């Protein structure tokens, strides 16, 4: 994606009803800090999910160690909060060639103060004035009270510890809902056990000229046996004897 927001207004994208391309995640290998939880990253290729939350933002190259489930520091204190029990992966890399610009990057922001620690996964777009001391400022700025938000300072003149990371966080769950997001060569005329689309049986699969209507799946015979099936990957009419 071309434009991640900051951490005070981080973008969240509920994703379901598709398939996971978890291979090139590991084959990317241009990513600085790439960690996971729940069960092993090699294991998560097939072990799949009801409903995932993909939320991303941009933070500093020093504060990214604050991003860890159950730590402290500003980004996890007032900006974006991983829960106490977490499943997903933290994906983190540098985008110094895009974000930090000569003449100064000050598009990005964050919240530096709030009158409590932040509830998990809940953003804070309320840019009203917090009153640290008791003197009421009441919306306008003043004394004992500060502005809530602050920018980052990004230029390519920064060191490597001050480079912008485009941290995308993937979070997962499991429910009464099914695994809506989830990650064998055909043998002709061979007695072969099989499964097509969950349909299971044992037969001799052949080429067959009986002609389906497109939406259809099975064929059947007089006896309510499963007579003929269509190969889902390459549409073809396959008998079952």
């Amino acid at each position, epitope marked *: 994606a071309t434009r991640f927001a900051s951490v005070y207004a981080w973008n969240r994208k509920r994703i379901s009803n598709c398939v996971a391309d978890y291979s090139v995640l590991y084959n990317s290998a241009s990513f600085s800090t790439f960690k996971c939880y729940g069960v*092993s990253p090699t294991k998560l290729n097939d072990l799949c999910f009801t409903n995932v939350y993909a939320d991303s933002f941009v933070i500093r190259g020093d504060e990214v160690r604050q991003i860890a489930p159950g730590q402290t520091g500003k980004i996890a204190d007032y900006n974006y909060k991983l829960p106490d029990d977490f499943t997903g992966c933290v994906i983190a890399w540098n985008s110094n060639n895009l974000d930090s610009k000569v003449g100064g990057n000050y598009n990005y922001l964050y919240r530096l103060f709030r009158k409590s620690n932040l509830k998990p996964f809940e953003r804070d777009i309320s840019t009203e004035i917090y009153q640290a001391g008791s003197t009421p400022c009441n919306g306008v700025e003043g004394f004992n009270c500060y502005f809530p938000l602050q920018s980052y300072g990004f230029q390519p003149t920064n060191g490597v510890g001050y480079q912008p990371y485009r941290v995308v966080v993937l979070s997962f769950e499991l429910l009464h809902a099914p695994a809506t997001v989830c990650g064998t060569n055909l043998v002709k005329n061979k007695c072969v056990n099989f499964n097509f689309n969950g349909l299971t049986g044992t037969g001799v699969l052949t080429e067959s000229n009986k002609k389906f209507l497109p939406f259809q799946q099975f064929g059947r015979d007089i006896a309510d046996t499963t007579d003929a099936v269509r190969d889902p990957q390459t549409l073809e009419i396959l008998d079952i004897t």
Partner: antibody, heavy 119, light 106 residues
């Protein structure tokens, strides 16, 4: 200052080996841990890095041993479980202390732990 | 994102040797150089490709240009030599140097 690695292993193919990297001499939650293999006659190979305070697995697929690293924070130990041992999994296993921040050296190591996978 | 090293480097005491770490396509400036004594844990010679860890004598340097990263040691001694490594930086996994065995003649 001290990463002490459990004794060498010898396991039959397809079996499992979990090797421990015990820590002392620094602050164990202030540093990530890399696990590095080196085969016979061959080079260093990084299998994964872990976090002491949380999961940190970013296992390069490389040889797929379903590898999982676990930190036992009480003893300041890091663990490496390697299953489906294969005839080329016979190699020395280094654990490598990394910085908690995005910096990633290994200045201090364990001594290596040889695992032989042979029928 | 794979790095390439030269297999063996043959020099003598007092001469300077340069052992490249050459990464396909983009490089990250940071790099980590490793001295492996036979059957001994490689020790990190160069961190960040601009600095050497404490106690490492000053003949040891590291650097990079373009897609290259050189391990360059001046005034060699017969005590010193050993197989040299680099480590890639970031980019998901770090590919460690194939290794280059430093021989010193004379």
């Amino acid at each position: 200052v001290q990463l002490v690695q459990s004794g060498a292993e010898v396991k039959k193919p397809g079996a499992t080996v979990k090797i421990s990297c015990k820590v002392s001499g620094y602050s164990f939650s202030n540093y990530y841990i890399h696990w590095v293999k080196q085969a016979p006659g061959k080079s260093l190979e990084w299998i994964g890095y872990i976090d002491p305070f949380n999961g940190g697995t970013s296992d390069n697929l490389k040889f797929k041993g379903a590898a999982t690293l676990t930190a036992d924070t009480s003893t300041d130990t890091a663990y490496m479980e390697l299953s489906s041992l294969r005839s080329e999994d016979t190699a020395v296993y280094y654990c490598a202390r990394s910085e908690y921040d995005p910096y990633y050296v290994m200045d201090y190591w364990g001594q290596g732990t040889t695992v032989t996978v042979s029928s | 994102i794979v790095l390439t090293q030269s297999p063996f480097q043959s020099v003598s005491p007092k001469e300077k040797v340069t052992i490249t770490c050459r990464a396909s396509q983009s490089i990250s400036s940071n790099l980590h150089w490793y001295q492996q004594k036979p059957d001994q844990s490689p020790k990190l010679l160069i961190k960040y490709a601009s600095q050497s860890i404490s106690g490492i004598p000053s003949r040891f340097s590291g650097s990079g240009s373009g897609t290259d990263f050189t391990l360059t040691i001046n005034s060699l001694e017969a005590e010193d030599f050993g197989i040299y490594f680099c480590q890639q930086t970031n980019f998901w996994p770090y590919i460690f140097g194939q290794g280059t065995k430093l021989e010193i003649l004379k």
